[PDB]
Every structure is written in structure tokens, then in C-alpha cells.
Amino acid sequence: FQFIATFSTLVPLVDCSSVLQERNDLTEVERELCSATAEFEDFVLQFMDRCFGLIESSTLEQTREETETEKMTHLESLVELGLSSTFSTILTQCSKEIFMVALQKVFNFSTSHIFETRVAGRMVADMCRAAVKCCPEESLKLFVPHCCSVITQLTMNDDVLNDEELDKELLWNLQLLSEITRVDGRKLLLYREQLVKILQRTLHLTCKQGYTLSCNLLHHLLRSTTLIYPTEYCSVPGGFDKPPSEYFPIKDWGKPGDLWNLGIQWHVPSSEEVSFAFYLLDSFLQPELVKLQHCGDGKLEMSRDDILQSLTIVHNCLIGSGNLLPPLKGEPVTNLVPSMVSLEETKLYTGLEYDLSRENHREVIATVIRKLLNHILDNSEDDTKSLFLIIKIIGDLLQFQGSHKHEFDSRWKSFNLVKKSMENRLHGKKQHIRALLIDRVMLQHELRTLTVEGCEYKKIHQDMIRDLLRLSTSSYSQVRNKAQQTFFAALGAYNFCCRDIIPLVLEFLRPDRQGVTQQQFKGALYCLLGNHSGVCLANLHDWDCIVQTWPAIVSSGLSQAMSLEKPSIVRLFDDLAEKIHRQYETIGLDFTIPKSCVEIAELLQQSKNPSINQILLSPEKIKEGIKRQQEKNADALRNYENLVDTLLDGVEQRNLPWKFEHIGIGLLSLLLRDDRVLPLRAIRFFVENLNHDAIVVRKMAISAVAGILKQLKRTHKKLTINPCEISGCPDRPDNHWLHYDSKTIPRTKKEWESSCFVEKTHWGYYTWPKNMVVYAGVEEQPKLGRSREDMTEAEQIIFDHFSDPKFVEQLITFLSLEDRKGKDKFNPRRFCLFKGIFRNFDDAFLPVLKPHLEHLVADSHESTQRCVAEIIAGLIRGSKHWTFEKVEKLWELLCPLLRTALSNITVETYNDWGACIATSCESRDPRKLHWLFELLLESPLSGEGGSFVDACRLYVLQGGLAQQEWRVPELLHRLLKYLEPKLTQVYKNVRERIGSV
Amino acid sequence: FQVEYAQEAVKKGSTAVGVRGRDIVVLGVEKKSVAKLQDERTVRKICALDDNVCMAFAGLTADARIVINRARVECQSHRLTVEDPVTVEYITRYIASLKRRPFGISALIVGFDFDGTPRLYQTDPSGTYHAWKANAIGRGAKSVREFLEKNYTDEAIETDDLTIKLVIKALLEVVQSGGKNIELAVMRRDQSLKILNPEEIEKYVAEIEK
Amino acid sequence: HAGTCLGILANDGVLLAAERRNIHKLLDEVFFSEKIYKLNEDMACSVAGITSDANVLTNELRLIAQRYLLQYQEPIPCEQLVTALCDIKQAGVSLLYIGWDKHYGFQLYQSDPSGNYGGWKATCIGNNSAAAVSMLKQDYKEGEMTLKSALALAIKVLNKTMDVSKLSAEKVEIATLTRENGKTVIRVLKQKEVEQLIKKHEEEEAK
Amino acid sequence: LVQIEYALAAVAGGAPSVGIKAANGVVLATEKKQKSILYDERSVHKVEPITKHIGLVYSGMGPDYRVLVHRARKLAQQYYLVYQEPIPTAQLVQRVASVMQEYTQSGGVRPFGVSLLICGWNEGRPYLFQSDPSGAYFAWKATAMGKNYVNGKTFLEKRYNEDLELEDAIHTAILTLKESFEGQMTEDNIEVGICNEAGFRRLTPTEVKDYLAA
Amino acid sequence: FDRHITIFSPEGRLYQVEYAFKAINQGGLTSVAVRGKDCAVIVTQKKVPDKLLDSSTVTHLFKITENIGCVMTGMTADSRSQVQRARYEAANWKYKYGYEIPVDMLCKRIADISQVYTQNAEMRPLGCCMILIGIDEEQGPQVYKCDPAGYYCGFKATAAGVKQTESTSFLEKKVKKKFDWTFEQTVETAITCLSTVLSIDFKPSEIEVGVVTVENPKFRILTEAEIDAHLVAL
Ligand SMILES: O=P(O)(O)O[C@H]1[C@H](OP(=O)(O)O)[C@@H](OP(=O)(O)O)[C@H](OP(=O)(O)OP(=O)(O)O)[C@H](OP(=O)(O)OP(=O)(O)O)[C@@H]1OP(=O)(O)O
Ligand SMILES: O=P(O)(O)O[C@H]1[C@H](OP(=O)(O)O)[C@@H](OP(=O)(O)O)[C@H](OP(=O)(O)O)[C@@H](OP(=O)(O)O)[C@H]1OP(=O)(O)O
């Protein structure tokens, strides 16, 4: 099908025998083509006799006597569309002499048989639909007289209005008529008094397939008479049929199909086709709306299936004639976002006037439903299939103009599948075929029919979404799932609706509510959990929305009708919390547009080439805009610090479940900001929750207090080095004017200052920067040893906990647990906890950690050796800006401490120590840690105990020397001089280290 | 192909060292840590096969417990038909032929073979087996075997000094300071299989530290 | 992960603590053996699986527990019943095993689905196991544990792993296995005794 | 577990069946439509007895049900030959769901496309179970399978109250099939079976028409 | 690989069972059965595709027992195989239970054999369907039908083969207006059914008719001149 449709959109299928006479235009190769065109009719007729056996051997077998397979499968739906494509392209690219001899092959097949209307019903009638879309005159002369003369024979003869199962030939000839009447709607005005006659007789049947084939008849008649669409898709604009023998057809086989002078033919609805489009709407919508009106008022009391049958008529008249129907009116205001500039909705003339004076049928349906839906949800809450149709109508009362939002996306992909397949990339846009280009112009019309960018949130839209919100929270999960998808699609369309509906949807989540069902409750949490790609309604990007949704999740739980024993609701909160942490992104507090936006004044003024807007004024409204921005900057700061207080009042809430505070700490870990400092009650919280019994909370408190200490960092001062002034004299490595960066002899022992410590490794290797910047001298950095007197008296209550020995001894105890025995590594986030402690406080806590450092090193357990190693390396990389007293006082207890630890190194510990002192050598000068490099290079292979210890003692030496990569030539020699006798007499586990060293 | 997947658990399982002496044969394995709340009784890797034969292992502890309780039947189904106890080569050839896919363990089958001769074997997971003076199986087996190649000749003067300055000194090459991380086994000629309690296991390490 | 059964060993008994999980409201609250399946006169078990594959694994353990008793006229030791199923699973659900025998006293085991077991002083299997394995490692006196002190630890670590606002007093299934007057007693504790441990926890932890 | 998930698609395409456990009885109501008037409505039966006191209905594939109704009758008589007592309803479902599991386990054999609803009566207490094609089985107060069973179980949860008698459960079972019937149910279009102290029996169609007058 | 054996589709369908119903339509023939108030008639097409056929050996009506008749529609080699099980299972009932098998229990026996083809992947379904007619001792005439799926329902009138759906609509329409039949003028209902949908009705030696009655329960295939009497009066 892909093969013949890609050939029969290039070559016209026309006989060439009247050109096979005396004519000097034919070359040697071209006369060989024209004689071979005698088999073009023999191709098309043998394509049909091969496709008829492809259909009649693919009819649906009803094997199981209980069920009815009604779905055409995905593999069979492709063969419908694969034969709807590959036959409509043959039969368009085809002469009228070969058409009409092939039209009869379709008619003498599809009317002498009776097909099952499920698989072979959609598949024969699509093959007839191709026969009608190519010549609607000659094809409709014989189908619609045949089908209408046999529906009226087989329906209205007896009393087959009320029935259980229709006759399978009556039920055939509706689908043979319904899927065939969507030709160009001008040439359906010949059959007005035949199509209306059967619609007045088979649309109000009782069989559930009988009226849906009649609703599809009413649908496609309205689709054909109000849409703009191309009627022909041929490769030549005149067609292969209307000038026979006026031009030679075998020249236009490789037609590049020019975009200028395309010759495209359109179907704009005339007033004859539009007044008929309202005459079907004035004879079948309004009689089906007055029966729904008096049923929702209490004065008709229809059956459960009688309402269901009537809504399909309302749905197939709305979805199907929506191009004629204006959207709404009413303009809801006074609660949305106010603006200084225009927020007018965009308007795109998709060509039709729709005079908007007579009826406005879309507003009448919106008033019938709000009475009908108010009756059904109170008087019969069990009628599911009526509620599915009301979701389908409100889904089209709001956002349905002439095209569909998903059918456009599937024709956009089907165009790029066809365009990118057969495209001359050698010479540009000038070789795309005409059948592609006509569809892309139609894809431009269909883009304009769906490009509703701005849409004002009106008062009817305030009511129709809230009626979807009742159906998003109703009794039945089948009804809730379909209603939420319409709810979420209607939240993306209209401007500031999500601020209106968060206060309405969180009313099903408050503890104080008296009667709220479990279907009422979790249906509102599928409204928060957006479960799609369009709108996450609990994780919006505004403070006025996040200050309501995040507390209401934590306020639920502690009291609600929250069945936490049902397993689906537990997966719902675990998805609602795991969508927030995945999707959250930090919100600004200062929208201060800088003074370098004279460009905006140069764009408002003096553009003038299209700019028909003669105002050009802002005398003191720029002061009002600054004032309202500073109020926005104040409220964004205010709603941030109210969000912290409302979560802490919800996590420190009595009688919470445990599963609702892990979400509550989980929403506080996202609020820890860089431009601000976290509020005081949260600094008290995360420090006190370091010692929490739940391992999940205190794993988050480690990740939060490490960020608090980054906020409380005290901003060291810097200065600039000219590297010519030091090193005595003014090219990619190891220069003459680079010798001071290489640690060999002159290491600082007493006069530790005035040494020009370059911290990070890579500086000065290749070249020098314009401004080589190091830290200051002695005591120009901020003061280290201080007490609570000279301190920020609100943000270093963290000082009060690490001085308390009960807090520390419980913190050391929890960190030496085992979260798992296998997956247990050197945590780089407990490291950044202790790096931010000893950097910020400058070993004010190290005398309170005297036993808890010396106890953990003298332990065989790998849990405590891992616990102490994050503290050891955090001491070392916290000792960057320490005075020379505190550095020597650090290593006076630390150099015996590692020699103890490197002695008792184990199998489950050498990756911890191999990432402990290899972490502590990260961005430090090799001057400032020579106590390591005199200890680690002391005796790595002089094995006091065992041989695997000597290999693990050498692997930790490897990562420390590698991390100070080129900054040390000397210790690489001292270790090479060490190994060059020793490398002959070692064992294999040491050889695998010496080779790795 | 399928036997190569067996060996990857031998290289990660705990070490197993055996030497062979003039009068006694000694196994010794690395007792790993279990958990904080795991009773460490059911995780011992020195199993007795009959009264004159025992073996260590390294690999899957599931497939070992199949190998042990199949070799414990062939140690007893031998005595029904032969009335003599197994030679150490008989049960080693039984375990190797027992190893679809081979059972992913490597063992150190030791003991005596009814004439008082000391024996030490190894069933690699390929199905192969051969004799040994001293051997090592497990995670650091290549370096321990290189250590035992250095020390074999004049150690068998005293059966105590043979079997600590080799066996515990070979575990101490790879395993920790000891005492609670060494499970050590020793059997004399036709006496019993005795696993040394850690009150006596720490006794021998103190002589080694001196 | 479906069940939430957890074992705790003490000096004078072992205890299983499973939670009764009821998904839909129209499921019948069965009055039969719900969560703690008694294997023979001195041993019980609990599975981390659906109650259909429970009836296959427990009625296979009961064949092993009675082919032993038919053969030796003694009750089966509480490791050989664990081992014989772990040999069958070696040729797909995790279990716990509480029991008593004359050899190694009160015992607790945990069969992996691969076929591996181990003696535990306290452990968890099923839903949020590592959340409660870690909580037992915080507070368990490994040797200084009385039965009621172990029993208060169970409803402590169950109040931080299952449900909302009541610890599901009618949906938690503590069974204790003790020695009394020579025989062996297995007491699935009643709803009045299971409710008071929630009351003795909510009073002691609030005060 | 791929074919087992696909056999449940064959169950959920099947005809609706509703079971409700009352105080003193169990009701099994189902859909027995015929495609034509040519089908004899009373020739084959969907509600089907196992013992004097156990009956079971299905949703799913017709012929796969008869394999399970032939094994459940053997397993009920292999109990009765040994123990000389009518089989407990709990013990019957354990043996039927072991048979349904036995075809998922062995290869080259597809699972059954059948869920079962198994009523019963033992020791003065009613029983209603449901065996899945996976071999799983669950005790229910009231449930439904077939087409629109998600809508059925939500309909049952609003109209269940454990103090209802057996005559009140026949109404709320036909009212559950009424919601997803799509037609006009006569005495022939449905099949009801009740199980009480007197035993299991499927209702004769003249007895059902009295319940259809409500 | 779920289209080459009898396992489920992701939609829950057995494709080989559905393809086996298409194997019934490959025979090019059509059988029609109908039940009377005291009679049961089956009517087939008897196509003689070669002039060298002994036409006595081309048939689709078969005696199963002395008073249970059959008609097979579909693959001819599969049809003779499924007769042979019905020949066996109806004589095995008489030996094990001492009375003639019902048409109830013979279809349920044959359909339970046919279910095993739809569950084991090592064998295909038989591409043919059986329509058994017979007189019960207490229920009167019975017309039942097995299919390749395994369904064994009971019928007032049924059809099989290429014109199965078209013959059903002819039999539904006559079974709604009246009691669908009376006595052995029920033969005239079935012969019109096979002649309306196939649109030939050429000769009275191109069909095959078999009957069971209350007054004569044995299955007797009508002769050519015996079946010309119903066709000259048609
Ligand atoms: O509107 P779509 O579907 O998104 O696709 C647009 C592309 O996206 P954009 O408009 O920027 O959003 C754009 O391509 P890039 O900018 O990414 O390179 C255009 O390229 P351009 O014309 O500038 O480049 P040149 O002409 O190829 O040199 C068009 O590509 P061609 O067909 O090769 O170009 P032709 O339209 O044939 O002239 C294409 O027009 P179609 O609609 O026909 O696919
Ligand atoms: O010593 P390190 O572990 O390598 O960390 C340093 C340190 O950051 P911390 O405050 O987190 O310890 C520097 O901070 P100061 O000493 O200058 O106060 C910071 O410098 P900046 O604050 O100016 O960014 C620098 O970052 P950088 O390398 O970009 O200069 C960063 O190094 P890392 O980014 O590698 O961690």
C-alpha cells in the first residue's frame, strides 16, 4: 500500500492511445511509456479485485457467544487507513474514463453484499468514500439513491422504531450511507429531500447502533457544510479528467508541483450550504434540546437510555457544526490577576462570518446541560453513559471550533511522515508534490482554527469548569477519569482560571468539613495531581497558589475522610509528592527590570512601520508600575515566609499520620533559598530533626542543614596577585615563574602567613588570568573564634545544639547506623554537612566531639568508620580559612587519629578512607596540608599487619596525590624512590595497587 | 560460558585457607560481619562431611547448602556398600562430578583417608579437582596463595606452630586484626573435627603478634 | 511489597506482628486464620504475599512438619523446617518463622525468595520493611529484652509504618509464642488486648 | 504474567455477573443473552451447581468455564468420598484456584479466560468467593465481573448493608445487572442462583419473573 | 507470536480460533438446520465438483448413532475426523451408561474436545462445525451445534458455512411470525432457506436432506426422488 500509493501519486493513470497516433512529440523512451499505459485500467481493476478479497476475507468472526467484539484492532485500523490512503490516491490520480469503469466495480460490490458493520463496515464504506471524493457528481448519482431507497424500505415499513436488534441490511445501509455523505458539501444540496427524510426516521430508533450510524450521518452532513477544506488532491491543478487529449499526459510524471500557481480548489460554505446547516440544526438539535430541557426541570422524566440517545444528537450537532457557533459572553473579573497592560484575546479570521444575531445555539446547549446535569447528579447518580456524553459536550462547548486538537496533531505527524520520506533534498522547496502542498495549506488553515492563544476567563467559563469539578469528584471512577481530562484541558485554555479554582478544589481537602465522601476526597486529589503534561494544579509557579496547595496536602491526613488504608490513595500521595519534587523550580522574589531597558521605550516609540497605536505616553504611570512591582516583591517575600510558617504548623501538628509529615518535610526542603535566609522556626526545625527516629526525615535534615550553613557563610575577602612580583622573574606546564605552586621544601611551619596559598589546583598551569585572585592576608578575613555575643542572634541557634552533649551524642549515634549493608558508601552529602559546620564555626564544636572522634576510629564496624570519615574530611576542608594556631591545633590530635584509622583499615572501609582523604585534598594547596603528605607517605608498604592493609594504605595515598595533580613533583619522586626497591618483592594485591599508583 | 558465572561468586565470597601438615590438617575462613540484629549462628562456612572429612566453601551460600547435603549422603552411602570411610579423593571426585550448570562453589575438602594420610583438595567450579599442600579460595585468594608459597618447608615441626604461623598468618594477610573475624577449624588424625572457639582463636593471634 | 509482618525475639518468647490489609470495602473480613499461620504445635509463620500463594507455602511447610513427626514422633526443630522449604525454593515469596525447639531455644528466621535464610533478632519483610528495619536497629536491646518490652516495641514501629490515627487496632495481628508449663502456647492476641497496647502507647508517647 | 493480564481482558469483555452475600444467603445473578431468537435460551446454563450446596457462575469465555465446572465437580466428590461430608466452600475454592493456577504455570497452555463467583453454605454461615485466572481468590461481601464491573462494584458499595436478607439481595443483584444490561430483561435474559440453608439451586424462570416485578 | 498459536491477544482474543471459523467458509458450501414441533431437518448443498466423482461418496450428512444425525460444514478432512469422535463418544456413552446419549450431552462432549484445541498450543482447532439433530426421550426434537471455539448451544434453527449470516436472517424472520414450524412440512422451511441465500435452486439432486421425527426417531437420509417431492411442491 505504501508502494503503490507512492507511485500513483506521481504518474497519472490515463490511457495514451489517441496520443499513440502520428505525433512527433514522443521520443524513443516516451513512446515506450504510452504503449504501456494500456495496463492502467488493468491495474486499477486488478487492484480492486485484490482488495475485495482483502476485505471479504477479513470480516469479523463472532466466536464467543457471550461477548461482542466491537473494537477494530490497531492492526486492523491501519489496514482501513492503509486502504483509505492507497486507494483514494489511485482513484484520484485517474482519468474519468478509467474512473467510471472503476466506480461500477465499487458499486456492484458494496451493494450486492451485506458486511458486518464493525470491521468490514468501516472498511468497505471507506473504499466507497474514496469513490465519492474524486467525482461527487457521478458517484452520488447511484449510491445515495440506492441506500435511501432501501433504508425507507427496511425501516419504516414495519414498526422497527422500537426494536432490540435491527436487520443487518438496514443496519448496513446506514453506515454505507453515513460514511459516504462527506463529499464536498456543495454537491450534497441536490439530495436535501432524501437525507432529511431518512434522518427524520432512523435517528430516533431504539437500537444503540441504529441511531449512532444515524448520528454519524447527521455529523458528517454538518461537517461537509461548514468546514473549509480542499476538494481535490491531484498532481495537476486542472485535473486528469477535464481536458482529455488537450495536453499530453505522459509529460507530467515527474511534476515538481509549484507552490505558486498551485491551482488549489476550496470549499467555502455558501449561504445555501449554511442555511441547510442550520436547518438540520433547527429540526434535530432543538427537538432534542426541549426533551432534555423538560427532563432536567422535572416535567418530562425520560428513561435512562432516552436521555442517552438524545445527548448523542446534541453532541454530534455541536461537535460537527461548531464552526458556526460563537463561544460565549460574560467577562468574569475582580478576582483574577490585575494588569497595567492589555490582556485582550487574539482573534483570527478563519473564514466565516457567523452573524451572531439569530440563535447562538452554543449558549442554549450550555444552559440545557447545567439544568440537565443538575438533575442527573441528584436524581440518578448511577447513569454512567449519560455522564460520559455530558463530559464530551462540555469538552466541546468550551474548546471546539471547526477542527479537533488531536486530529490536527495526527495529520501534522502524518504529513511529516510523508514529506520527509519523499523530498528532493538536492534542490529545495521547488520539488514537493502537489498532494503534499495542498495538505500543508490545509494544515495552515487547521492551525489557525486552533490557535486560540489568549482567551478571557468569562462567567460561563467560571460555571462550566466548576460543573466539570463536580464530575471530577463524583461517585464513579470511570466518570471521574473522563471528567478530569476535560477539566485539565480547560485549565490550560483560559487565562487566570487556576487561581479561581484552587480555592474551590481544596474545599474537599479540609479537616473541618462535615460530610465529604471518599470519592469526593480522592477525586479532588486527582485534580491536584495533574497526571498529564498540561497543568499540575498543586505545583503552580506562583506564590499565591503554592501557599494554599502545599499546606492543604499536609493539612489533609491529620483529620479528613482520608482512607489511608486503601492502597490507591497511598500511591496517590506518593505520586503527588513525587511530582512536586520533580517539577518544582525556584520562584523569584525580585522582578526588578533593570535600567537598561531604554530598548523598551525604543520599541514602544518610533517603531511606527506597522505600529498603529498613537498613545506614546507614560508620565507617572511608570511610578505606579514601580510601586506595584515593589508590592509584588513584598507579597512574594511575604507569601514565602508564610509558606514556611504554615508548613511548620502542619508538620508539628498533633495526631498526624507519619506519611503526611514526610511530605511536609518534603515541601520544606524545597523552600531553602539562596537569595534569602530561611526563617527562624525552620532553622530550629531542621537542626532538631537531625535527631529524628525516622531515617528518611533525618536524611533530609542533613541535606537541609548543609544548605543553611551555605546561607550563613560569611563571605571571605580576596585580593589580586601579579605572579611576576613573586617567583622573582616573569609555556604550558611547570614554568620558571611557577615554582611557588610546587610543594617541595619551603612548606610553612611557623610564618604560615605571607605564603600566597593558591587553593584550586588548575591555576597558573597553562597561562595566567587577567586577574589572578587569592584570599587576603592575616585577619582581613572575618574573625573565627567568637561567642554568642558577637553573632547573628537569630540564625546561630545551630550553635546551641552542637554544643549540647546530649544532641551530639545522639547525632553521632544515628550517623553510625547501617542504612544498608551492601549499598553503603562515603556519603558526599554528610560531608557537606560537616564541611559547612567547621568552616562556619571554626572548631568551636571540636572540643565537644573529643570522645566521638576517638571512639569511632577504634571500632571494627564499617558503619562507624564510615561515620567518622565524613567528619575527618569535613574538618580538613573546613580548615581552609583557619588561623595558624588552629591549624596546628587541628593536626595535633588528627595526625595520631588517622594513623590509628589507617592501621585498622578493612575490606568494607578502604573505599570510605579512599574517598575520605582523597576528598580532603580536593581544592586545597599542597602547602596547607603537608601533615597528610608526611603521614600518608610515611610507610605505605612497610606492612605492620598483613598485606591487604598495605594495599589499602597505598590506594588511599593514590587518590590524595592524584587530586593534587601537577602541584607536586617531589612527593611523586619520594614515592617512586620508595617503590623502586619494593616493587619486586610484593604480592598481587599490592602489585595491582603499585601498577595503579 | 555457564561455568564462568559460577566463578564470579567465588571471587567475591569470603576467603578460605587450608594448609596440610604431617599430622593435622587445618581450614580457616573469614567470618564476615552479619548485621546488627542478625544471629550469626546460621552463617558458618566450615561444614563437616563425615567423621574424617570436612570442607570450606566460597560462593553462593544457597548452592553450597545443596552441595554439602549431597556430599553428606555419599559419605554415608559409601559406608553402606564399602564399610570403609571415604577417601578424601572419593568425596572430592563426587563433588566435582556433581558440579545442567555446575553449582557455583569452590571448596577445600580436607581430612584423612583410612591410612592416616593427610589430604587437601579443591573443587573449582569447572568440574576439576586436584591435590594441594596449601591453598586459598575466596576474595583475596591470589595473594594468600602467594604468601603460602613463601612459607611451607620447616613449619611442620610442631603442629601448633605449623597451623597458626601459616593459617591465621595467611588470613591476617587479607582479613582484619582477628579474633572475631576468623573461623578456624582443625582436625587431628582420627580424633574429631573441632572448631576453635574465639577464646582460643584470640590466644593464637597473640603468639603471632609477638 | 504487600505485607508488613515483623518478628522480634525476646528472652521469653518471639512475636510476629502483621497488619491486616483490606483494599476494598466489599472484601469479606474473614474470621479464619488471617495473617499468622500456625505450622505445628511449637512453630508459626507469616508470609509477605497474597493469601493464595500463602496457602501453597504453608500447606507445604505443614507436610514437612508432619512427615517429620510421623517419622520421629518428635516436633520438628525450628531450623530444619526452615531449611527444607529453602531447599524447595532453591529448585517465590519471603517469610518469617517463629518457633521453639529444645536445641536452640526461641528462634526467628527470614527466608529470602532465592532460598536463603538467617537467624534474626528482629527483622521486617514486605511493605516499608527498610523503614522499619532501620527503626528496630535504633531501639532494640539485643539481649536485655522482655516480652512486653518487645511487645511495646512492635506497636511502636507499627505506628510509624502503616496507617492513620489509630494504628489500625482492628487490622493488626500480633501473635506471641511463649513457653508455659512444659507445652508451647501460641496466642494470637485478642482485639481487646491489641487495643490496649495502642492505648498504652498513645498514653506513654504523648506523656 | 503477560497472558494472565490478557486473560483478564477476556474476563472483562465477558458478560456481567453479580454476586452478593446476604445475611442468610448468597445470590449469583448473571447475563444470559442470546444473539438471535434462534438460540434456545434454556439449553445451556451459566449459573451451574457443584454440590447440593455450592454453585458457581462466570464471566469470560464459555468453553473454558466447562473445564472448571467439570473439575470443581470432581474435586467436590473426591472430598465427599474421603470425608463423607459436603465440602466446605472455602476448601472448594482452594482446589479450583489451584487448577486455574496449574495452567498458567505450565507452558504451551494458555490460562483460562474465566473469573468465577463461587457461592456456598457451611455451618450456618454463607460464603461468596471469587477465583481469578491468576489462581488468586478473594472472599467478598458483594462483587461483580464482566462488562462494566468497575461501575458495578461502585454501584454495589452504595447499596450494600450487611443486615439485608436473601430476598433483599436478589433485588440489589438484578438492579446491578440492570445498570449494564442495554435492553429489556425478560425471565430468559438473566440467570439467578441462590444459596441458603436449604442448599444451592438455580432459580426457575417463572420464579425470576416475580423478582423482575421490582 | 500471539497469532500463530492459540494464546490470547492483548485485547483478550484468540486469533487462531477466529481464523478457524474462516476455514469453515473455504469449503464453499452451506448447511441449514431447523427444528419442528415433532421433527428436525438438516439441509446441505451437495456440490459435485468433478464429473468423475462417485456422488454416493460425497456427502456431509452422517449417522452418529441409530437416532442421532449429523451434518458437517467446513474442512472435509477435519469433518471426517470430528465425526469419528462423535461416532466413538456416542457409542462409548451406550456402553458406560446403558442408554442412548442425548443430543445435549453429545455436543457438550464434542465441544469439550474442541476446547482443548483452543488451549494447547501444540495443535490447531478443527476448521469445521457440527450440527447434531435428534429426538430426546422427554424433550422432543433437538437441533444443536458445536463450533471450533467450543460452544454447544441449542437451536430452534441454525446455519453454517459461507452463507451462515444470510441464512440466519431468513430463519430469524420465520421464527418470529409463527411457531417457526409444525410437522414435517418443516422440510419446506429449510430448503427455501438454502435456496433464497444462494439464489440458484437449480436441481433437486444438488441438496441432501436428513430427518428425525417423533413417530420415527431414527436418522434417515432422504433419497433423491423423496426430496424431489418437497421440491416439486416448492
Ligand atoms: O512549519 P514547520 O512545520 O514547523 O516546518 C518549517 C520549519 O520550522 P519553522 O517554520 O522554523 O518553525 C523551518 O525549518 P527550520 O527553520 O527549522 O530550518 C522551515 O525551514 P526554512 O524555510 O526556513 O529553510 P529552507 O527553505 O529549507 O532553506 C521549513 O522547512 P523546509 O520545508 O525545509 O523549508 P520550506 O518551507 O520548504 O521553504 C518548514 O516549513 P514546512 O511547514 O513546510 O515544513
Ligand atoms: O574549598 P572547597 O571545598 O573546594 O569549596 C570552595 C569554597 O566554597 P564553600 O564556601 O562551600 O567551602 C569557596 O568559598 P570561599 O572560600 O571563597 O568563601 C568557593 O568560592 P566562591 O564562594 O567565590 O564561589 C569555591 O568555589 P569556586 O571554585 O567556583 O571558586 C568552592 O569550590 P568548589 O566549587 O570546587 O566547591
UniProtKB/Swiss-Prot annotation, chain A:
Name where it's found: Cytoplasm, Cytosol; Nucleus; Nucleus speckle
A single cellular component GO annotation:
spermatoproteasome complex
Annotated keywords: Cytoplasm, Developmental protein, Differentiation, DNA damage, DNA repair, Nucleus, Phosphoprotein, Proteasome, Repeat, Spermatogenesis
| GO BP terms, alphabetized | DNA damage response; DNA repair; proteasomal ubiquitin-independent protein catabolic process; sperm DNA condensation
User: Quick check: keyword Ribonucleoprotein in the entry?
Assistant: no
Spell out the subunit comment: Homodimer. Interacts with the 20S and 26S proteasomes. Component of the spermatoproteasome, a form of the proteasome specifically found in testis.
- State what protein this is by name: Proteasome activator complex subunit 4
Q: Which organism is it from?
A: Homo sapiens
UniProtKB/Swiss-Prot annotation, chain B:
Question: Which keywords annotate this record?
Answer: Acetylation, Cytoplasm, Glycoprotein, Host-virus interaction, Nucleus, Phosphoprotein, Proteasome
Mind telling me which Pfam families this protein's record contains? Proteasome, Proteasome_A_N
Q: Which InterPro entries does UniProt cross-reference here?
A: Ntn_hydrolases_N, Proteasome_alpha, Proteasome_alpha-type, Proteasome_asu_N, Proteasome_sua/b
Please provide, alphabetically and separated by semicolons, the GO molecular function terms listed in this UniProt record: identical protein binding
Q: PTM per UniProt?
A: Phosphorylation by ABL1 or ABL2 leads to an inhibition of proteasomal activity and cell cycle transition blocks.
Which GO biological process annotations does it have? proteasome-mediated ubiquitin-dependent protein catabolic process
**Per the annotation, which location comes first and is thus the protein's main one?**
cytoplasm
State the conditions that upregulate or repress this gene.
Answer: Down-regulated by the ribozyme Rz3'X. Up-regulated in colorectal cancer tissues.
Cellular location(s): Cytoplasm; Nucleus
> Which domain of life does the protein's organism represent?
Eukaryota
Residues modified to Phosphotyrosine: Y129
GO CC terms in record: cytoplasm; cytosol; extracellular exosome; nucleoplasm; nucleus; proteasome complex; proteasome core complex; proteasome core complex, alpha-subunit complex
**Record-linked PANTHER family:** PROTEASOME SUBUNIT ALPHA/BETA
Q: Which family does it belong to?
A: Belongs to the peptidase T1A family.
Q: What does this protein do?
A: Component of the 20S core proteasome complex involved in the proteolytic degradation of most intracellular proteins. This complex plays numerous essential roles within the cell by associating with different regulatory particles. Associated with two 19S regulatory particles, forms the 26S proteasome and thus participates in the ATP-dependent degradation of ubiquitinated proteins.
| Protein name listed in UniProt | Proteasome subunit alpha type-7
Gene name in the database record: PSMA7
Swiss-Prot record, chain C:
Give yes or no: UniProt keyword Signal.
no
Tell me the superkingdom of the source: Eukaryota
The answer to whether keyword Aminoacyl-tRNA synthetase applies is: no
Specify the protein name. Answer: Proteasome subunit alpha type-4
**Where mainly located?**
cytoplasm
- Which residues of the entire protein appear here: the answer is 30 to 246 of 261
Family the entry assigns: Belongs to the peptidase T1A family.
Which subcellular locations apply to this protein? Cytoplasm; Nucleus
Q: What is the gene called? A: PSMA4
Q: Which species expresses this protein natively?
A: Homo sapiens
The function of this protein is: Component of the 20S core proteasome complex involved in the proteolytic degradation of most intracellular proteins. This complex plays numerous essential roles within the cell by associating with different regulatory particles. Associated with two 19S regulatory particles, forms the 26S proteasome and thus participates in the ATP-dependent degradation of ubiquitinated proteins.
Which residues get modified to N6-acetyllysine? K137
From Swiss-Prot, chain D:
Give the keywords, sorted: Acetylation, Cytoplasm, Nucleus, Phosphoprotein, Proteasome
Indicate the impact reported for L92V. In a colorectal cancer sample; somatic mutation
Regarding how it is modified after translation, the entry says: Phosphorylated on tyrosine residues; which may be important for nuclear import.
Cite the InterPro entries for this sequence: Ntn_hydrolases_N, Proteasome_alpha, Proteasome_alpha-type, Proteasome_asu_N, Proteasome_sua/b
Q: Which residues form the signal peptide?
A: none
**Subcellular location(s) of the protein:** Cytoplasm; Nucleus
Assembly state and interactors? The 26S proteasome consists of a 20S proteasome core and two 19S regulatory subunits. The 20S proteasome core is a barrel-shaped complex made of 28 subunits that are arranged in four stacked rings. The two outer rings are each formed by seven alpha subunits, and the two inner rings are formed by seven beta subunits. The proteolytic activity is exerted by three beta-subunits PSMB5, PSMB6 and PSMB7.
Indicate what this protein is called per its UniProt record: Proteasome subunit alpha type-2
* Organism field: Homo sapiens (Human)
Q: Which gene encodes it?
A: PSMA2
